[PDB]
Design a protein around this ligand. Structure first.
Ligand SMILES: CCCCCCCCCCCCCCCCCC(=O)OC[C@H](COP(=O)([O-])OCC[N+](C)(C)C)OC(=O)CCCCCCCCCCCCCCCCC
Ligand SMILES: CCCCCCCCCCCCCCCCCC(=O)OC[C@H](COP(=O)([O-])OCC[N+](C)(C)C)OC(=O)CCCCCCCCCCCCCCCCC
Ligand SMILES: CCCCCCCCCCCCCCCCCC(=O)OC[C@H](COP(=O)([O-])OCC[N+](C)(C)C)OC(=O)CCCCCCCCCCCCCCCCC
Ligand SMILES: CCCCCCCCCCCCCCCCCC(=O)OC[C@H](COP(=O)([O-])OCC[N+](C)(C)C)OC(=O)CCCCCCCCCCCCCCCCC
Ligand SMILES: CCCCCCCCCCCCCCCCCC(=O)OC[C@H](COP(=O)([O-])OCC[N+](C)(C)C)OC(=O)CCCCCCCCCCCCCCCCC
Ligand SMILES: CCCCCCCCCCCCCCCCCC(=O)OC[C@H](COP(=O)([O-])OCC[N+](C)(C)C)OC(=O)CCCCCCCCCCCCCCCCC
Ligand SMILES: CCCCCCCCCCCCCCCCCC(=O)OC[C@H](COP(=O)([O-])OCC[N+](C)(C)C)OC(=O)CCCCCCCCCCCCCCCCC
Ligand SMILES: *[C@@H]1O[C@H](CO)[C@@H](O)[C@H](O)[C@H]1NC(C)=O
Ligand SMILES: [Ca+2]
Ligand SMILES: [Ca+2]
Lengths: 1276, 166
């Protein structure tokens, strides 16, 4: 499409347009835009500083230079130079800003302000190698499409169900007496009420629940109006803030029903992102199995690195012969150095150093800080000598060549430099802290150990150079969204309020913290609720700023899910290279089935004790039900020991059987005194663990995981060293800070005392008078032990913002926070967070690569062609024809002639879609004319769908209609709709109909019925539900033990609202303690619950405690408890990750391009066309027309018919039975051998009998020679 | 054959026929909730609200849950006709709607629960009674029993792929 094709002097421009460094001049001017948009400080209501005012004029420089460039790109070629799509955006960026100059003259508006953010995408198109990355990143998106489309159906189901169950339910308030103020307590979120039963009595003493609006977050967390429902089941799916949307419903309706809505949204939202991560790791691994056949090239490689091993070694043999009285000192420096002594003389020094550097208190009374300086002075005197003995008696050139001892050079020099610089005295107090942090590098001295250290660094540093392309795309992704958010939000966080909206965007670093906060998932809920409330809070135009925090969280994770593959394809390349009476009882059915029924009754009472009454009727029943149960138990340990004796304790199940029984017996000795107590009660919980060793599925799963730990152990031992190394740099840098005074105006110790004013809401006419004291921020960095606590929670991506934003605000030793002092200390929490994210991901890749080895260990017994070549034999050898239930009676036959057609197929699919939008609208405060229409609609859509099951049942003749389960599922929906119509209109002559409405929603699940590519993915998981649910048995057991251990212990805990153990989040009953643990299992702010259990909480005035002891029911076992729950939840959820690799392995190693069984599964459906009587034997005439209509991956050409496919079928040994009626199995085997490549005779008969040997070797049925007669049909 | 012959349907159909008798018991019985004002004590019923002090004076005034319970017995009638036709022609498929009808027999009993739990809040001291506890166990019998008979009627996911859903 070229433009006039001329040759003036303009042809000489083409020699200058495309010279060499024209890329470099444009690279250096787009990088100026990145800085020009970074120093753009936004201002709230039309304000401009000076530098902001000069940078407005600097755009006109970058307007014309990008126009001087681009017009020369037109003169260079013309309209065909829109060929690069990445240049097609080039003129697109410029053509908006020329329009911006036009609208600039209209002033002598902020929509084009946001398009200048797009310019660094030009920086991608300039620099190559990132053309490799963006091309590679869209190629992962093809196999993920069915997973992402089911999550899109996962949200729409739970948006409509949450819309019809909860419309309008939140709008109740707890206002004061008659006022407009919503009544809270001091941290309590403004949560709804109900005047009627089951939700919130509203006991805040001078307040009455009235209609209007208390609402969730500010208006944004409703359930009315399809768009809000779909927004607040989105946030719930990301497991972030799903407990406020639970505890708001649970506060308005009432509990005990709406838990089943959210804990099935989490358990399905988890399960279908857990198989999205395994989705991407399918498509690129099958490419990499095709390069594993270069096994003879690693044989050449390990020879060469053996040649590099000798050649350096022999040359040191040469080196230490050349430089050779003073030799008498030499042999001394062999016999002292290489001896057993310096394997043990150095450790006493090093382990004595890492206790010196990790002592580090706040106060250190006076003698400790004197020992810190002498030790450092002493232990350097051992460091230099140890080094100096290597200087003489090892060889000078050999010493510096080793990298680990080059590291020891940098240590010993820096120790001397930092000691003498203090004696010089001329050093700033900023610098002596820096010298102190330099010593901390001595901790790597410990790493002269780890035997695979040199294997480990070669694993990690090889991975980074597979990520350094992608990781530079991630950093240039988080810049575009930081430059965008600064234009949309840009100091619109004004709000006229007093609460700290602290992650604002009104700066470049504050928008770079705040984007990286919503990237890692932590607390993006509070962030999105400010961008929505900055513009127009909730409205039409305004809630479309949700779209900024969606694409940032979906795309910003999909980049980061693609660094998970490039490691996994790099980490996979390295992997290529009378006692007879007691004897019966133990083996009786009477006794084993006794125990399993007795365990279940033992722990049903042990589940729900009181557990806090100690006097009531639910105690005297259970004390009789407990002591009588210890009798039977102990009785069982008698009858096991009378069969074997003292040597039966070999089994790990009997060592626990004898442990739980002896403690339950001593509770009877402890109940023998009261007439020690409760400890022995809880030792009875171990029981069902014994029943777990009676399960067999786990032997495969748990054993496969401890294979993977052996190879990942090396990484885990390093990632827990960094939490010690960044503890000691974290202590060093934040000692005594985080020590904040209650009113933020007093700043030091003595004067944060007395009483002050707390001004409510916003105005200084509502003064309340509270006292003030030091608050110590609960996760402080004081001790190295007490800093591994805090740095463990920022490791789990939970609660870092609050802590991170505190580490910014800190100043000198015992002083309160200054507001935005030193943002430079946000680099600590970033580099470490990013690092731990990189070692947590290398572990995860380990558990994947190990299991794909361990599943293929079963298929190393191969002697066969391929996996696809394995299944398609088992698809031919095993399959059988299809139903084809064709009717008689031409009255009825005309009816069937409609039903199976595409008339009903396309019509009943259509009326669901109108039934979707009929449920789609359904907003709140709708009109009464609209209430009349949708009540008709519901009546209309039932009569149509019941007319479906009338026509089909008069067609399919009952036999066949119940056959498919989808028709039986329709019969469940239809009757639930008819009983929903009737129950509504009988009322018109009624709250309970809210369940029957759900049946109206389930019609959307008829959609996926025709969606063939999706149903085939759910059915894979139901077929996979084999090795999973025994792993789920350990999850249930885990939640069961930690419920009962905490329930006796963390009860008496005084459900005061505002204090994070409240009426929604009890520890008291058993199902309230299961849900609390499901909160800590999805990481939902578990760090507070830990602080809620303590030593000084109140004790719930229903218990005893009768004098005084009113603030002593907390039990600090919680640090031992929530932490020990959190690792045992993390480790065991990894076994859910492993168990999904286990049975889905045939689906995750597919190749749906070569021999996809979708061609095979559709192939049965052509047989019903020509063989309709289920005879299972076709005529050999109409196979010929059946060949031509399949698909060219499995059928034949459109060059039809041929002597080619007909040459193929005569070329196959196709048998002809009586009259020439073939079976499908002989025809299927020939038409799969058309793709499964073949030869002439000789090789054909050799393939036949070897298939007979391979199938019979597979066949554990040594009988049934009809399969061998099937090889006479398929082969002969 | 193969659905009906396994004892899985034996135990499950028997359990249901217990809860059917419990359901027929819980409808005609009269002790749902104790009116206790403190006399003019009474018991709510689906058909009669009888006043007791020993003087027993029965009459009636909760209109909705009465007509719902008619529908709950209507499926229990239809759910047993389909089951008795099932065993006699080697026809397995009639257990498929017969398991469906028991579930809607269960849910319509559950509505009759939560209407009667609602009418207490309209109105003096209240507590529940024994036939309300009979109706709770009649629910759990039927609703779990109908679903379990539904699952036992359907055959096994093809597990291996060459015998899908027939
Ligand atoms: C291809 C890569 C992505 C391209 C990057 C740019 C994407 C498009 C950006 C749209 C420009 C928005 C203009 C910002 C200013 C809004 C106008 C205004 O001031 O009205 C204020 C008013 C009041 O807000 P106010 O109170 O804060 O301002 C008051 C100050 N005065 C009086 C001077 C205006 O708000 C409104 O009622 C109208 C809002 C305009 C519509 C809101 C939509 C903007 C967000 C859409 C989401 C885009 C997501 C981008 C990322 C997704 C990737 C595709
Ligand atoms: C079709 C396929 C199935 C989809 C079902 C959804 C049907 C839409 C319902 C009709 C919309 C409607 O009119 O609602 C009324 C409302 C407007 O009605 P209203 O209630 O605000 O009117 C005012 C009435 N008073 C005065 C009482 C307040 O429209 C909406 O707000 C709907 C939200 C619009 C955007 C949400 C759509 C879904 C988002 C999809 C994102 C997916 C991206 C990734 C792929
Ligand atoms: C599912 C596992 C087993 C279910 C647990 C118990 C269900 C019975 C519901 C109890 C109803 C009741 O008595 O009152 C309602 C209970 C108790 O309510 P309440 O009445 O006590 O509260 C008010 C108390 N008074 C009136 C004194 C003021 O309330 C709830 O909120 C129930 C919490 C839901 C249970 C949590 C289940 C989530 C965790 C699942 C395990 C994780 C497994 C992962 C593997 C997947 C396998 C499935
Ligand atoms: C090892 C590499 C990282 C070491 C950096 C340590 C420097 C800070 C220090 O020594 O004491 C704090 C010191 C001690 O505070 P100060 O008491 O000297 O306060 C100085 C007072 N003014 C500011 C007025 C002069 O704090 C500082 O002010 C030093 C400035 C640097 C601030 C940010 C440090 C970098 C962030 C940590 C990165 C960790 C990377 C890990 C890999
Ligand atoms: C499997 C992994 C879980 C095993 C947990 C083993 C730790 C045992 C906890 C015992 C304990 O500290 O009691 C605290 C409390 C009682 O101890 P206490 O601390 O409240 O009372 C003593 C108070 N001092 C020490 C301050 C004088 O909890 C209990 O009631 C005991 C039951 C927990 C036993 C769980 C082990 C079962 C296996
Ligand atoms: C690998 C990563 C391991 C991380 C664990 C490190 C824990 C840091 C301990 C710091 C506790 C602290 O700050 O002291 C508070 C207190 C300080 O006194 P305090 O009571 O004034 O402070 C508590 C704060 N309030 C009051 C707000 C609750 O120290 C104590 O004396 C309490 C008891 C100390 C016990 C230390 C807990 C150690 C937990 C580790 C064991 C977990 C089991 C794991 C085994 C199973 C899984 C493998
Ligand atoms: C494409 C494939 C996608 C995957 C397919 C699978 C998706 C799963 C779809 C079903 C979701 C099931 C969860 C819905 C049940 C939620 C129950 C609920 O919200 O209770 C609140 C409601 C409470 O409504 P209410 O108004 O009657 O409560 C009365 C309270 N006052 C009077 C104060 C208003 O409870 C119910 O209506 C249902 C009760 C039983 C439900 C349990 C059986 C299921
Ligand atoms: C508020 O509660 C306290 C104790 O709970 C009570 O003494 C006081 O009278 C209450 N206030 C009012 C206005 O009743
Ligand atoms: Ca998270
Ligand atoms: Ca979180």
């Amino acid at each position: 499409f070229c433009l006039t094709l001329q040759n003036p002097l303009r042809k000489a421009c083409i020699s200058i347009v495309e010279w060499k460094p024209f890329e470099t001049i444009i690279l250096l001017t787009i990088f100026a835009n990145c800085v020009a948009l970074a120093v753009y400080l936004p201002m709230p209501e039309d304000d401009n500083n000076s530098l902001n005012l000069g940078l407005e004029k600097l755009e006109y420089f970058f307007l014309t230079v990008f126009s001087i460039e681009a017009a020369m790109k037109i003169i260079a070629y013309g309209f065909l130079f829109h060929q690069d799509a990445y240049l097609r955006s080039g003129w697109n960026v410029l053509d908006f800003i020329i329009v911006f100059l036009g609208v600039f003259t209209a002033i002598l508006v902020k929509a084009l302000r946001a398009f200048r953010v797009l310019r660094p995408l030009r920086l991608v198109s300039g620099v190559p190698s990132l053309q490799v990355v963006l091309n590679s990143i869209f190629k992962a998106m093809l196999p993920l499409f069915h997973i992402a489309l089911l999550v899109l159906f996962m949200v729409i189901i739970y948006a409509i169900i949450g819309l019809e169950l909860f419309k309008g339910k939140m709008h109740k308030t707890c206002y004061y007496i008659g006022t407009d103020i919503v009544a809270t307590v001091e941290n309590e979120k403004p949560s709804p009420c109900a005047r009627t039963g089951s939700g919130r009595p509203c006991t805040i003493n001078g307040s009455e629940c009235r209609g209007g609006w208390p609402g969730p977050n500010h208006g944004i967390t409703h359930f009315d109006n399809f768009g809000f429902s779909m927004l607040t089941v989105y946030q719930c799916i990301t497991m972030e803030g799903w407990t406020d949307v639970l505890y708001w419903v649970n506060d308005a309706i009432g509990n005990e029903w709406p838990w089943i809505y959210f804990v099935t949204l989490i358990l399905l939202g988890s399960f279908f992102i857990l198989n999205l991560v395994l989705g991407v790791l399918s498509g690129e691994f099958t490419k990499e199995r095709e390069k594993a056949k270069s096994r003879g090239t690693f044989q050449k490689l390990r020879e060469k690195q053996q040649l590099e091993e000798d050649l350096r070694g022999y040359m040191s043999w040469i080196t230490q012969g050349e430089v050779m009285w003073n030799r008498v000192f030499r042999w001394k420096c062999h016999d002292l150095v290489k001896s057993r002594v310096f394997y043990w003389l150095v450790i006493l020094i090093v382990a004595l150093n890492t206790l010196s550097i990790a002592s580090e208190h706040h106060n250190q009374p006076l003698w400790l800080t004197h020992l810190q300086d002498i030790a450092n002075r002493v232990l350097l005197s051992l460091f230099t000598i140890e080094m100096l003995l290597k200087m003489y008696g090892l060889g000078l050139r050999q010493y510096f060549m080793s990298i680990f001892n080059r590291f020891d050079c940098f240590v010993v020099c820096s120790g001397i430099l930092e000691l003498l610089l203090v004696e010089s005295g001329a050093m700033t107090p900023l610098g002596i802290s820096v010298l102190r942090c330099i010593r901390l590098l001595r901790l790597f001295k410990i790493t002269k150990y780890w035997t695979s250290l040199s294997n480990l660094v070669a694993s990690l540093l090889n991975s980074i150079r597979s990520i350094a392309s992608l990781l530079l795309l991630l950093f240039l992704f988080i810049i575009i969204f930081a430059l965008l958010g600064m234009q949309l939000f840009g100091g619109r966080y004004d709000f006229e309020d007093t609460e700290v909206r602290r992650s604002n965007f009104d700066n470049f670093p504050q928008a770079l913290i705040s984007v990286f906060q919503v990237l890692t998932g932590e607390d993006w809920n509070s962030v999105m609720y400010n961008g929505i409330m900055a513009y127009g809070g909730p409205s039409y135009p305004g809630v479309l700023v949700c779209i900024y925090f969606i694409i940032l969280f979906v795309c910003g994770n999909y980049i980061l899910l693609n660094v998970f593959l490039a490691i996994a394809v790099d980490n996979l390349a390295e992997a290529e290279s009378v006692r007879v009476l007691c004897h019966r009882i133990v083996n009786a059915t009477w006794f084993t089935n006794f125990i399993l029924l007795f365990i279940l009754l033992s722990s049903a009472a042990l589940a729900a004790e009181d557990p806090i009454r100690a006097e009531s009727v639910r105690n005297q029943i259970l004390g009789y039900f407990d002591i009588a149960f210890t009798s039977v138990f102990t009785v069982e340990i008698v009858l096991k020991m009378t069969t074997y004796g003292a040597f039966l304790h070999k089994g790990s199940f009997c060592r626990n059987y004898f442990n739980i029984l002896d403690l339950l017996v001593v509770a009877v000795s402890l109940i023998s005194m009261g007439l020690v107590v409760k400890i022995l009660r809880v030792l009875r919980v171990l029981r069902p663990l014994r029943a777990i060793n009676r399960a067999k599925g786990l032997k495969h799963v748990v054993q496969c995981v401890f294979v993977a730990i052996r190879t990942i152990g090396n990484i885990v031992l390093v990632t827990t060293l960094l939490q010690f190394m960044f503890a000691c740099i974290g202590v060093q840098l934040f000692k005594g800070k985080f020590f904040s005074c209650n009113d933020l105006s007093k700043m030091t110790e003595e004067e944060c005392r007395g009483y002050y004013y707390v001004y409510k809401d916003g105005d200084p006419t509502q003064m309340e008078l509270r006292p003030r004291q030091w608050i110590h921020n609960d996760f402080h960095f004081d001790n190295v032990l007490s800093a591994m606590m805090s740095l463990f929670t920022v490791s789990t991506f939970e609660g870092w913002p609050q802590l991170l934003y505190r580490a910014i605000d800190s100043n000198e030793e015992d002083m309160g926070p200054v507001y935005n002092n030193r943002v430079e200390m946000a680099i600590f929490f970033i580099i470490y967070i990013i690092l731990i994210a990189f070692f947590m991901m290398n572990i995860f890749v380990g558990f994947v690569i190990v299991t794909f080895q361990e599943q293929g260990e079963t298929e190393y017994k191969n002697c066969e062609l391929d996996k696809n070549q394995r299944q398609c034999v088992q698809y031919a050898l095993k399959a059988r024809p299809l139903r084809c239930y064709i009717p008689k009676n031409p009255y009825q036959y005309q009816v069937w002639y409609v039903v199976t057609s595409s008339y009903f197929e396309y019509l009943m699919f259509a009326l669901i879609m109108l039934n979707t939008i009929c449920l789609g609208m359904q907003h709140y405060h709708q009109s009464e004319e609209m209430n009349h229409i949708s009540d008709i609609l519901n009546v209309a859509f039932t009569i149509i769908f019941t007319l479906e099951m009338i026509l089909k049942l008069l067609a399919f003749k009952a036999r066949g209609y119940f056959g498919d389960p989808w028709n039986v599922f329709d019969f469940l929906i239809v009757i639930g709709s008819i009983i929903d119509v009737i129950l509504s209109e009988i009322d018109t002559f009624r709250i309970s109909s809210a369940f029957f409405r759900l049946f109206r929603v389930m019609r959307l699940i008829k959609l996926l019925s025709r969606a063939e590519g999706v149903r085939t993915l759910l059915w894979t998981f139901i077929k996979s539900f084999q090795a999973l649910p025994y792993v789920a048995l350990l999850i249930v057991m885990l939640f069961f033990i930690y419920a009962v251990i905490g329930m006796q212990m963390f009860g008496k805990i005084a459900l005061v609202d505002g204090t994070q153990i409240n009426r929604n989040n009890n520890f008291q009953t058993f199902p309230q303690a299961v849900l609390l643990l499901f909160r800590c299992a999805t990481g939902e702010a578990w760090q507070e619950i830990l602080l809620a259990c303590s030593y000084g909480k109140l004790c719930d005035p229903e218990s005893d405690y009768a004098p005084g002891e009113e603030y002593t029911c907390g039990t600090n076992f919680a640090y031992y408890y929530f932490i020990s729950f959190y690792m045992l939840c993390a480790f065991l959820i990894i076994n859910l990750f492993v168990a999904v690799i286990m049975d889905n392995f045939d689906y995750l190693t597919r190749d749906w391009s070569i021999l996809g069984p979708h061609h095979l599964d559709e192939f049965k459906a052509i047989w019903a066309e020509y063989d309709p009587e289920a005879k299972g034997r076709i005529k050999h005439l109409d196979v010929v027309t059946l060949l031509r209509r399949i698909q060219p991956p499995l059928g034949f050409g459109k060059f039809c018919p041929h002597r080619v496919a007909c040459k193929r079928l005569v070329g196959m040994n196709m048998p002809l039975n009586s009259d020439g009626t073939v079976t499908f199995n002989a025809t299927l085997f020939a038409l799969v051998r058309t793709a499964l490549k073949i030869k002439t005779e000789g090789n054909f008969e050799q393939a036949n009998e070897e298939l007979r040997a391979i199938i019979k070797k597979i066949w554990k049925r040594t009988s049934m020679k009809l399969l061998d007669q099937v090889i006479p049909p398929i082969g002969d | 054959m193969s659905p009906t012959e396994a004892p899985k349907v034996r135990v499950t159909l028997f359990c249901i026929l217990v809860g059917i008798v419990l359901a027929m018991t819980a409808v005609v019985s009269d002790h749902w909730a104790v009116l206790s004002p403190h006399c003019e004590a009474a018991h709510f019923g689906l058909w009669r609200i009888c006043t007791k002090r020993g003087e027993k004076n029965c009459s009636y005034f909760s209109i909705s849950a009465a007509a719902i319970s008619v529908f709950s017995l209507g499926f229990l009638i239809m759910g047993t006709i389909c089951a008795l036709m099932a065993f006699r022609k080697k026809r397995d498929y009639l257990l498929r709607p017969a398991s469906m009808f028991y579930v809607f027999a269960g849910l319509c009993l559950f509505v009759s629960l939560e209407v009667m739990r609602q009418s207490v809040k309209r109105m003096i001291e209240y507590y529940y009674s024994w036939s309300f506890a009979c109706a709770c166990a009649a629910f759990v019998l039927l609703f779990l029993g109908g679903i379990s008979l539904l699952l036992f009627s359907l055959p096994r996911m093809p597990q291996n792929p060459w015998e899908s859903c027939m």
